[PDB]
Amino acid sequence: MANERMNLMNMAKLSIKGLIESALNLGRTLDSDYAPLQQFFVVMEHCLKHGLKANKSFWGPLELVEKLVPEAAEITASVKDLPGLKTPVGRGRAWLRLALMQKKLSEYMKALINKKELLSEFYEVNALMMEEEGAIIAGLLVGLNVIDANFCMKGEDL
């Protein structure tokens, strides 16, 4: 457990740094095809899934966000009650991508680890989010604020 926390963190730490790095060299905006980005979201998903008590999954902890940060109210309304997204996990994923497009990822995460009594209904006493590793990740997610992304196209528009 205490290790699975560092295995995840050190994972997240590398992904974040490898995304920002890969991103600066490219120079263009990202979509949902950029491999380094899909990686991040997956890892990211493993950190929020870890610790969760025994069904919404890592979605429940995120739903909370808009209650702490009213700014995350629009993206939370865009993902739920949507015909396509039927799974709580599916909604969570979509949310993270939407939040990442606002460069609000670290802001929302820092607000969740800053409220451990609220986050204790979703995570166990020693979950990554309930421990210091979750604080490290939230602080690192500040680097993704220099990454421009957009996962909203396929229909011409030109």
> Which domains are seen in the chain, by residue range?
1-158 (1.20.58.900)
- Measured distance CA(122)–CA(73) in Å, rounded: 20
Q: To one decimal place, what's the resolution in Å?
A: 3.2
Structure determined via:
X-ray
Residue 125: count other Cβ atoms within 10 Å of its Cβ.
10
Report residue 92 as tokens. Answer: 């969570």
Report residue 24 as tokens. Answer: 């600066």
> Are 126 and 2 a contacting pair, CB within 8 Å?
yes
**Bridge partner residues of 52 (DSSP):** 123
> Are 152 and 30 a contacting pair, CB within 8 Å?
no
What is the widest separation between alpha-carbon atoms in the chain?
A: 51
Question: Could you tell me the CA-to-CA distances from 22 to 58, 69, 91, 106, 143 in Å, in that order?
Answer: 27, 30, 27, 19, 13
Residues 6+ apart with CB under 8 A from 71: 104
Closest CA to 127 of 141, 142, 113: 113
> Are 58 and 92 a contacting pair, CB within 8 Å?
yes
- Measured distance CA(125)–CA(131) in Å, rounded: 8
DSSP for residue 13: H
> Are 61 and 119 a contacting pair, CB within 8 Å?
yes
- Measured distance CA(128)–CA(130) in Å, rounded: 5
Q: Coil, helix or strand for 5? A: helix
